[PDB]
Design a protein around this ligand. Structure first.
Ligand SMILES: COc1ccc(Oc2ccc(Nc3ncnc4[nH]ccc34)cc2)cc1
Length: 294
């Protein structure tokens, strides 16, 4: 097998001391580093400068575009050399994929699900608003903050698979006839399965699948390994069945996203009202313990 892209102990740009590898999936590796300028721990993403698919150029572009917005890591630095490309950003805390897996039956309560859901929808509207599609919405791309002031905030952690979908003016770009999907089968919309150009609604489909998995603990295509077979299931599936364990207003959510296509801007305010109305109906308040606190 290959060694780690970076040796633990090295200094990147005479500033970022590599301490430990913390992740390895996607199209590179991520490390906890010490920033010797600010004297703080940071996250350091790296990719080989020779590997066939490099995505950190996209990571930097989107992270920069989103500075000042909610639910995103603070940008700290970036660079390219003959060995590796790197991006430095705020280090966060516990990953939603991990937090869900730690639950008794892999489920969150509707209180935790609704609050996380609404934060995630905020993060999706935000990336759409600067002209990018995420295209890889899944639990492991979100984490809670790691300080008292940030640990009730959910952050969108990665943008590697994003695509710019607009002009500078906000004109939706003509879709390609074929678009080869590189995201996760489990949370992918039918359009990803069909190798169609993904749109804003495909990120909302993936959120819908994440919310259902949070409350039910599994999706109907949990045990199916073949990507096509998953696609077939989704193509025929009656998504109304997934409403059973969601608050009633999610019928509005599902009817709305079902109506959308590549060329149709989502009604984000309608989808936000589904969360806001559900949270009031269930008497949920922001200070209530999340499931991992209690
Ligand atoms: C499928 O379930 C999984 C997969 C991978 C995984 O590991 C990690 C580890 C780190 C990160 N990312 C980050 N972490 C902390 N601070 C961060 N700032 C920016 C990215 C980042 C994401 C998943 C955890 C759960």
């Amino acid at each position: 097998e290959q060694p780690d892209i970076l040796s633990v102990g090295i200094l990147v740009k005479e500033r970022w001391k590599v301490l430990r590898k913390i992740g390895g999936g996607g199209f590179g590796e991520i490390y906890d580093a010490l920033d010797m300028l600010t004297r703080e721990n940071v996250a350091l993403k790296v990719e080989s400068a020779q590997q066939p698919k490099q995505v950190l150029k996209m990571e930097v572009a989107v992270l920069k575009k989103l500075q000042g917005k909610d639910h995103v890591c603070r940008f700290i630095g970036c660079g390219r050399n003959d060995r590796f490309n790197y991006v430095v950003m705020q280090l966060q805390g516990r990953n939603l994929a991990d937090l869900r897996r730690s639950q008794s039956r892999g489920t969150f309560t509707i209180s935790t699900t609704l609050r996380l859901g609404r934060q995630i929808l905020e993060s999706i509207e935000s990336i759409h608003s600067v002209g990018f599609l995420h295209r890889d919405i899944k639990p492991s791309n979100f984490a809670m903050g790691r300080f008292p002031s940030t640990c009730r905030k959910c952050y969108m952690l990665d943008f590697g698979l994003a695509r710019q979908f607009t002009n500078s003016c906000g004109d939706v770009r003509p879709p390609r006839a074929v678009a080869g999907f590189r995201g996760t089968v489990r949370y992918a919309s039918i359009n990803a399965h069909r190798n169609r150009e993904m749109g804003r609604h495909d990120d909302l489909w993936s959120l819908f699948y994440m919310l259902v998995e949070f409350v039910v603990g599994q999706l109907p295509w949990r045990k199916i390994k073949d990507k096509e077979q998953v696609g077939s299931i989704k193509e025929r599936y009656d998504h109304r069945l997934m409403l059973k364990h969601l608050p009633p207003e999610f019928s509005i959510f599902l009817d709305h996203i079902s109506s959308l296509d590549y060329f149709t801007k989502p009604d984000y305010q309608l989808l936000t009202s589904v969360f806001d109305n559900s949270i009031k109906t269930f008497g949920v308040i922001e200070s209530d313990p999340f499931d991992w606190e209690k």
